[PDB]
Design a binder for this molecule. Sequence first.
Ligand code: HEM
Ligand SMILES: CC1=CC[C@@H](C(C)(C)O)CC1
Length: 415
Amino acid sequence: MDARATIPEHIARTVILPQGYADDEVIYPAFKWLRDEQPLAMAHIEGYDPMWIATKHADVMQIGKQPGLFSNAEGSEILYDQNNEAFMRSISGGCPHVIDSLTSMDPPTHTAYRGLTLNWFQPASIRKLEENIRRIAQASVQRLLDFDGECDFMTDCALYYPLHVVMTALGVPEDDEPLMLKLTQDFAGVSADEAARRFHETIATFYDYFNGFTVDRRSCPKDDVMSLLANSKLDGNYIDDKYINAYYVAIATAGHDTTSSSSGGAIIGLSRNPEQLALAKSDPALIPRLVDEAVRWTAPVKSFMRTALADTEVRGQNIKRGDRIMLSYPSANRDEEVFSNPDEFDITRFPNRHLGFGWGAHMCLGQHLAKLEMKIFFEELLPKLKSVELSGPPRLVATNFVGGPKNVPIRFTKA
Ligand code: HEM
Ligand SMILES: CC1=CC[C@@H](C(C)(C)O)CC1
């Protein structure tokens, strides 16, 4: 169906479906064709709604800038097929959002709820976590060095530090690591009535757990995010638990896999470019540039969706009210109008105006926490390594949402 779809079926299938994202050489050439030939065009494949695919850096920014025109709330902000979206709606009392997180909201609601924590996530505030992050980073570096020159960088190291950081930011104690892992890896990881029961049950268990903290921080405040949210008010009243608990989940889930995935990306980049490892070791001031290149090149968030709320024009295309739009951050990050030799990992790349954290109204709340923890982590790691190389191929997550490296088998020499 839909006569406006011009993107060839094989191209559309590659960029929309999950499987392709397990392989850089499948996905990136498909987006390169789109950027060259059909930068912003409509695809319609079986099992999915018709959608515009924003492949250009300029277009992703322009759309992201305008939440009044391009909505997160009206449709699913996550790229589900029609079956899975139907399942989500039936579970969530009709609406296309599992929980009441920031990415489900439009202004002014979004502005209000984002505003509750926005200052806390700014660099000057985040800077106070440096000492705790340093300790956490060193612990992860240490458990890597406990291996005799061989391990999986993801499962044996990078899986842990970003979760512990996000736990420290929230105020979840170290001993709750198993539960938080269940949250991010099991529950939020990649019959019908039975699955619906397990879901409501699981989310209720996590919400009950989180409510314990909300209650605690109203009597015993701390400098963490739970305490900030528990004691926040709007119109002279506490924020409804559903918004608070969604905030805790959104922070933990958005903060863990993305950061681990990008760290893995860095290691892949450095293993394939040993000259750059030597560069980062000789000049540790380059590490923030290394961190930005890792995020650009890895681009662990593959897509978010928008719904057009009115008829409008982007790159001379007539986007109708109700039209769905896929924002491809990976494609924007390899846009040749912005980046020279985009497929190359290069830590000296400056400026590095990538869209790995998105752009506009919903731009990653955690970006400064992410950059700080990755910086600190690599500051601690790189001095301890003489060399690093891949021992086998990296395994990428087969997902069109939050993917990138899941396994990065490596060998290393200790400095
Ligand atoms: C390399 C690390 C990370 C990447 C690549 C990343 C990427 C993204 C992207 C693409 C978005 C959507 C932006 C948009 O729609 O314009 C986003 C949103 C968000 N991220 Fe991150 N993120 C990272 C780390 C973190 C961390 C560490 C946290 C929290 C501690 C976090 C919390 C969030 C939240 C709360 C949102 C939703 C903000 C909103 O809807 O207004 N992220 N992130
Ligand atoms: C990057 C990120 C991934 C998870 C999102 C969700 C679905 C928890 O709101 C929030 C933002």
